[PDB]
Each structure stands twice: as C-alpha cells, then as structure tokens.
Amino acid sequence: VKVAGITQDFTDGTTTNTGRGLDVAISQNGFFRLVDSNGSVFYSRNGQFK
Amino acid sequence: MISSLWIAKTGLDAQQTNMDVIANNLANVSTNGFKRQRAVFEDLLYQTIRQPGAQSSEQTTLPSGLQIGTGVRPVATERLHSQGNLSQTNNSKDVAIKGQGFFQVMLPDGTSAYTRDGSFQVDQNGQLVTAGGFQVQPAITIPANALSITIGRDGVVSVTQQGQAAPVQVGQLNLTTFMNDTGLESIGENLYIETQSSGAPNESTPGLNGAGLLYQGYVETSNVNVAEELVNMIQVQRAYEINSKAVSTTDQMLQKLTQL
Amino acid sequence: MISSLWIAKTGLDAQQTNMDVIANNLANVSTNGFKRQRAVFEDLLYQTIRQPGAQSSEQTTLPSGLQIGTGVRPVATERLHSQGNLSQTNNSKDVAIKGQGFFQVMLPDGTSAYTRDGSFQVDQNGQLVTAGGFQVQPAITIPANALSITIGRDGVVSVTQQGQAAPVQVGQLNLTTFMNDTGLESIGENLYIETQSSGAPNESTPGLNGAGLLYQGYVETSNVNVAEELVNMIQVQRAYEINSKAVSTTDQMLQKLTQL
Amino acid sequence: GKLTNGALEASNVDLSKELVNMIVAQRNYQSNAQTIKTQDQILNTLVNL
C-alpha cells in the first residue's frame, strides 16, 4: 500500500464568543493574510490578534 | 532431482503465493475502493505410466491405472468484486458508488483508466481530479467563485455561485461498466485499465441500464474481512509447514540412499 | 577456500554490518539531535567465463553469458537528516532547530565543529558552551547578574538585568548550512566536522537564506523510528541465518568431497 | 465569508470519531503485525530444514 496523500478537512468549525474586541472569526471561506520577518506571505484562519 | 522434491517445491511456491495474497489484502485494509484478491490453483501434469482403461486382456480392462501426478500451479488471482461498506465522512468532494460501475479517468499518456475511488480533489485550474492528480472525464470544471458543490444521484454536478438562488450545472458524471469486471488490469494507484477479457467499456448514466448510483459525502471502503484473513493465515502457515516437512522427508530419504 | 564460501562469508559480514547499524540506531534513541544511519550495499565483481554477447558462430551472438558473481560490499552509511519531534523542556538555555542549519562550536584543537544539539550551558566564565564544554561560536557572553535569557527566533540573545527596563543584547547565534548535509564526518559527542564532500560552510542568520529558525525551550529528539528497526532486526536475523545455512551447505559439500 | 467580531473559530476535531478510528487503526496494525509474525514462523520453519 502507498499513502496517496494527507488532506485537511476545510469545514467551518465552532464559533465561540471570547469577549475580546481583537479576535475575528471567519465564517464560510476566507483566509487572513500575514507577512513574517522574512517577507514571505502566509495565510491563517486563527483570528487571535494582538 | 527427484520427483517428490519438485512436487513439494511447487507446493511451497503455491502456499507462498497464498500468503502473498493474504498479506497484500491485509495491508490494504483501509484503502478506499479496494477489491480483495483470491488465488486459485490447479493440478499439474499427470504421468500416465499404466494407462487408465488400458486393455490388459482381450476382455478385461484395467480400472484407474497408475496415474502419478505432478505438483500444483496457480491459475490466477481474481478480484472479488463486491460492494464495500459506505462511510459518511461528510465532504462535498467525496462520492461513493452503489452499484457496479466505474469512474473514467484520463491518464497523462492519453489513454483512459477506470477507478472506483471517489475521493476527488480540485486542481489549480478548477478541474475535478483523482487524489493522484489524474483528471476525471468527461471533464467537470469548477469555477473559482464556488460556494457549494452538489453531486446528485444521477451524476449531475452543480455549483451555486454567490447570491444566486439557482444552481449552475457544470457537467455530468458518467459511469463505465464492463462485461467482466475481473478481467481488468490493475495498474496501481487504485486504477484499472481495460483488457480484452473485460469486453468493451460501456458508458452509462447512473440509474439507467445498469450503472450504479452515486451518493455524495460517502466513501466506499474495502471489502477485506480481517477475521477470514486471520483464519486463512493460520491454515496457509500449517500447509506451508507440512509441505516443508515433506521436503525434509525427501531429503532424509535421499541421504540414506547416497550413504549406502 | 572455495568461491561459494567466500561469497557467503561476504554476505555474513554485510548482514553483521547491517545489524551493527541497527544497534547503533537503537542505542541513540534518547540522544538529542541524532540522525539515524542506513547502510547501502553493492554487488561485488563478476567472474566472466563466457563473455555475454561474444560471437559464437559467424553470425549468431551468445546472449547473457556465464556471469558468475562474487558477494556483496557495503558502499556507505547515510544519515537521514530529517526534522525530529520537538520536545518542550521549558528551559531558557535549550534551543531547537526548525530547519536544516547547524550550530558552530570550537574544539580545543582550534578547528571548528558543527552540532545540531541545543542543550547549552554556561561555564564559569559566563560563555555559552555545549554540554561537552565546547565553546559555541561566534561567541555569546552572558553577564553575571542575569535574571532571564531570551533567545529569539532569529538568534538574538538578550539578557534582562535588574533595574534596567530594556533588555540587553549579548550576542547573535548563527547557523551554518552545507550544500551536502550527509557528507559531514561524525567525530562523536554529537559533533560533525566538514569534509570536502560536505561542500563549504555557509554561515547565515536563522530566517535568512535557508537556515532554519531557533525555538527556545525546545529540544530536537532523534528521528529514530523504533518499529521499523524491530522489523529490520527480524529481517536481518533471518537473512543472517540463511547465509549461515549457505555456509553449512558449502561445508557439507566439501566434507563429502574429502572422503571421496 | 463575513467577519464576526469578538468570536474565535474553534477547531473541527470530533473526539468520538477520533477514538473509534484509533480503535480500528490499532486492530489493523495488530493484524499486520500478525501476518508479519506468520511470514517469519514460515521462514524459520524453512530454515530449520
């Protein structure tokens, strides 16, 4: 047998209230766009911002 | 060098083939759309010596003459085409077949293979492809601005765009059926190609003259049964050990003779 | 003394080398930043007898002549330079690598060695040293009255002093990368030295070029997978027994020769 | 999709499915180990000839 690949279940998860004004939840499709110290472009669903 | 040695050297090889089939079946117990194998064996030569039914006297025949036989050979390993249990893994891109049909997929060299695996992905250009990156047929493109993909029981693929209350049809998925499903040649990666023993590829729509039904959000698991493979291992191991004991007995017999 | 005996003797030696490699991999499970070894073999020379392709008649060539071969020899032992699992020890001095870089240390000989181990200590002089006491170039001195050490993801080392609201930078940890990582010569004590097959040491900061990042409070565990080693041990034991059986068969044939 | 302020998107890992998959994977791994052990007891028997 051969492992064809490893996928990721991109379904919308739980939305949980936190009470902080700087957390954002993305319903449906969408990715937050980030840049690191090097300058590469990354994408993330975690809305815990500071 | 002696007859019993060759016969028990064929017995060993046949039992090793049986163990190979069992181990391959057990290794692929989790691959989706898998069909397990079964090895079949047949008798080798039968040396005539005294012919059975030979006319010994002018009125008396010899019943069941001295028919010394040779070992065993395997005809082939045949695929047990049965419906594997469907699993609800709740993704819009997983589709499972309910009948006896196959998906058609276009190989990079221009030829067409046939697969029953329903785990489909979307490439960068928007086409439906197999998880190995092979594009499905007769090509079902998916727009970038897609909100939901709906594949019905008839194979119709629909895409709902933003803010529009009506779905957009982007293609029609068809199933290929064969006269003989066993004769297909497996090329790996859950792909089968057509062979002359499998007749010709009959394309059909899912629900008509014999193609199966497609269920969205479902994956067809393998039909391998673990307990039966365990019991078959226990019996193949014993048979292999007993044939090896026959080899050893022949070896001991040849020792005394030479020593004489 | 006979060709088959030499061939079997070479096979035994190769399997023993494989067993030593497996034992070395097993002994270094708990070592930090250890890369497992794998041995590669090659088949030895061939006694020619009849040359394959030699013109037998005026027009017909001889296909696949009598190429009787000798045993086997191991070419190389290659490391698997793959990112091992990171373990949180919550220590201010332990550093872990995320990419494919190496720490540069100074041996007391005067030459430079390279290590992937990150468990660092401070000596009585306040410098950063490896657990074997080797001083970690390009050299970080930690002051006496330190309250906490912060090593950033890019390698900046800062010390928070009492009464100072701002951290004080005391150095910059750098990573060396090689064009060929497997060519390094291991001298023991978790140290690799540069050879001519390991390219040239390219020094860079963690983040720039291709060097990996530094994680504080983490240690890189060895990449040794154990179950694979157990299966390899079973295979090695059986192959060694088979080669020993070949030796025994050759010995028996020689014994039956002598008496003649 | 739309942004909801003051809320975080939690993970989508269901624990029950993970546990049952762990059980079935353990059983499959044990079956493969069993056939590995059988192939050896066959090789050992052949060797002891």
Two tokens, residue C96: 């872990």
Query: Residues with Cβ < 8 Å from B76, sequence gap 6 or more?
Result: B39, B40
- Kindly list the distances between the CA atom of residue B110 and the CA atoms of A4, B106, B134, B135, B185, in Å, as whole numbers in the listed order: 22, 6, 11, 11, 17
Per the CB < 8 Å rule, is A15 touching D3? no
Q: How many CB atoms lie within 10 A of CB B159?
A: 19
With beta carbons under 8 A apart, name residues in chain D contacting C242.
Answer: 47
Number of helices and strands (H, E) in chain D? 1, 2
Q: Report which of C93, C35, C80, C36 is spatially closest to residue C218, judged by C-alpha positions.
A: C93
Element (DSSP H or E) covering residue B153? none
Torsion sign across C-alpha atoms C83, C85, C91, C92:
positive
Kindly state whether B146 is in contact with chain D, defined as any CB-CB distance less than 8 angstroms. Answer: no
Two tokens, residue C76: 């190389």
Query: Residues with Cβ < 8 Å from B105, sequence gap 6 or more?
Result: B112, B113, B114, B115, B130, B134, B135, B136, B137, B191
Rounded Cα gap, residues A34 and A18, in angstroms = 22
| Secondary structure (DSSP) of C8-49 | HHHHHHHHHHHHHHHHHHHHTSSSBT---EEEEEEE--EE-S
Smallest CA–CA distance from C233 into chain D, residue: D40
Taking the CA of residue A39 and the nearest CA in chain C, the distance in Å comes to 10
Query: Residues with Cβ < 8 Å from B92, sequence gap 6 or more?
Result: B148, B149, B150, B151, B216, B217
Question: Do C114 and C176 form a contact (C-beta atoms < 8 A)?
Answer: yes
Rounded Cα gap, residues B146 and B162, in angstroms = 7
Please provide the size of chain A in residues: 50
Question: Do C177 and C100 form a contact (C-beta atoms < 8 A)?
Answer: yes
Q: For residue D16, give the 3-state DSSP assignment.
A: helix
Q: Which of C234, C242, C245 faces D40 most closely, judged by CB atoms?
A: C234
Question: Do C222 and C229 form a contact (C-beta atoms < 8 A)?
Answer: no
Query: Residues with Cβ < 8 Å from C164, sequence gap 6 or more?
Result: none
Please report, as a single letter, which amino acid is at residue B105. Answer: V
Burial string for B166-189 (b: 16+ CB within 10 Å, else e) reads ebeebbebbbbbbeebbbbeeeeb
Query: Residues with Cβ < 8 Å from B202, sequence gap 6 or more?
Result: B176, B177, B178, B179
Residue B113, beta-bridge partner list:
B105
Query: Residues with Cβ < 8 Å from C116, sequence gap 6 or more?
Result: C33, C35, C97, C102, C103, C190, C220
Per the CB < 8 Å rule, is B91 touching A2? no
Rounded Cα gap, residues C104 and C177, in angstroms = 10
Residue D35, beta-bridge partner list:
none
Taking the CA of residue A29 and the nearest CA in chain C, the distance in Å comes to 30
Taking the CA of residue C149 and the nearest CA in chain D, the distance in Å comes to 33
Query: Residues with Cβ < 8 Å from D47, sequence gap 6 or more?
Result: C238, C241, C242, C245
Two tokens, residue B16: 């090793």
Smallest CA–CA distance from A18 into chain D, residue: D7
Query: Residues with Cβ < 8 Å from C195, sequence gap 6 or more?
Result: C183, C184, C185
Rounded Cα gap, residues B233 and D41, in angstroms = 11
Question: Do C63 and C52 form a contact (C-beta atoms < 8 A)?
Answer: yes
Technique of determination:
cryo-EM
Per the CB < 8 Å rule, is A24 touching D2? no
To which residue do tokens 């067809």 refer? B220
Per the CB < 8 Å rule, is D45 touching B229? no
Taking the CA of residue D49 and the nearest CA in chain A, the distance in Å comes to 33
* Strand stretches in chain B, DSSP E: 37-43, 46-47, 68-69, 72-79, 86-88, 95-97, 102-106, 112-115, 120-122, 128-130, 148-151, 156-160, 168-172, 175-177, 185-188, 191-193, 202-204, 214-216, 218-220
Kindly state whether D21 is in contact with chain B, defined as any CB-CB distance less than 8 angstroms. Answer: no
Q: For residue D30, give the 3-state DSSP assignment.
A: helix
Please provide the size of chain B in residues: 260
Q: How many CB atoms lie within 10 A of CB B65?
A: 15
Smallest CA–CA distance from D38 into chain B, residue: B237
To which residue do tokens 């019943």 refer? B63
Alpha carbon B87 to chain centroid, angstroms: 20
With beta carbons under 8 A apart, name residues in chain A contacting C208.
Answer: 38
Question: Do B67 and B47 form a contact (C-beta atoms < 8 A)?
Answer: yes
Around C213, how many Cα atoms within 13 Å sit in the side-chain half-sphere? 11
Quote the crossing angle between the two packed helices D15-47 and B226-259, to the nearest 10°: 10
DSSP A25: E
Question: Do B13 and B240 form a contact (C-beta atoms < 8 A)?
Answer: no
To which residue do tokens 């004080």 refer? C168
- Kindly list the distances between the CA atom of residue B42 and the CA atoms of B11, B16, B46, B80, C122, in Å, as whole numbers in the listed order: 11, 15, 12, 19, 76
Rounded Cα gap, residues C89 and C218, in angstroms = 6
- B contact residues 45-84, partner A, Cβ 8 Å cutoff: none
Rounded Cα gap, residues C129 and C120, in angstroms = 6
Please report, as a single letter, which amino acid is at residue C94. Answer: D
Resolution (A): 3.4
With beta carbons under 8 A apart, name residues in chain A contacting D32.
Answer: none
Rounded Cα gap, residues C80 and C228, in angstroms = 14
- Phi then psi for residue C230, to 5 deg, are -65, -45
- Phi then psi for residue B24, to 5 deg, are -65, -40
Q: After which residues is chain A broken (C to N over 2.5 A)?
A: none
Q: Outline where chain B has alpha helix (H).
A: 3-27, 226-259
Q: Which of D36, D40, D47 faces C242 most closely, judged by CB atoms?
A: D47
- A contact residues 3-42, partner C, Cβ 8 Å cutoff: 36-38
To which residue do tokens 């080797």 refer? C134
Rounded Cα gap, residues C215 and B194, in angstroms = 54
Element (DSSP H or E) covering residue A44? strand A41-44
Taking the CA of residue A4 and the nearest CA in chain B, the distance in Å comes to 7
With beta carbons under 8 A apart, name residues in chain A contacting D6.
Answer: 17-21, 23
- Kindly list the distances between the CA atom of residue B105 and the CA atoms of B119, B150, B177, in Å, as whole numbers in the listed order: 13, 20, 13
Question: Do B220 and B33 form a contact (C-beta atoms < 8 A)?
Answer: yes
Q: Which of C231, C234, C245 faces D47 most closely, judged by CB atoms?
A: C245
To which residue do tokens 């699992």 refer? C85
Kindly state whether C228 is in contact with chain D, defined as any CB-CB distance less than 8 angstroms. Answer: no
- Kindly list the distances between the CA atom of residue B66 and the CA atoms of B45, B47, B246, in Å, as whole numbers in the listed order: 13, 8, 22
To which residue do tokens 């030979």 refer? B54
Kindly state whether C66 is in contact with chain D, defined as any CB-CB distance less than 8 angstroms. Answer: no
Rounded Cα gap, residues D17 and C96, in angstroms = 34
DSSP C135: B
Two tokens, residue C94: 């332990």
Around A24, how many Cα atoms within 13 Å sit in the side-chain half-sphere? 13
Query: Residues with Cβ < 8 Å from B85, sequence gap 6 or more?
Result: B220, B221
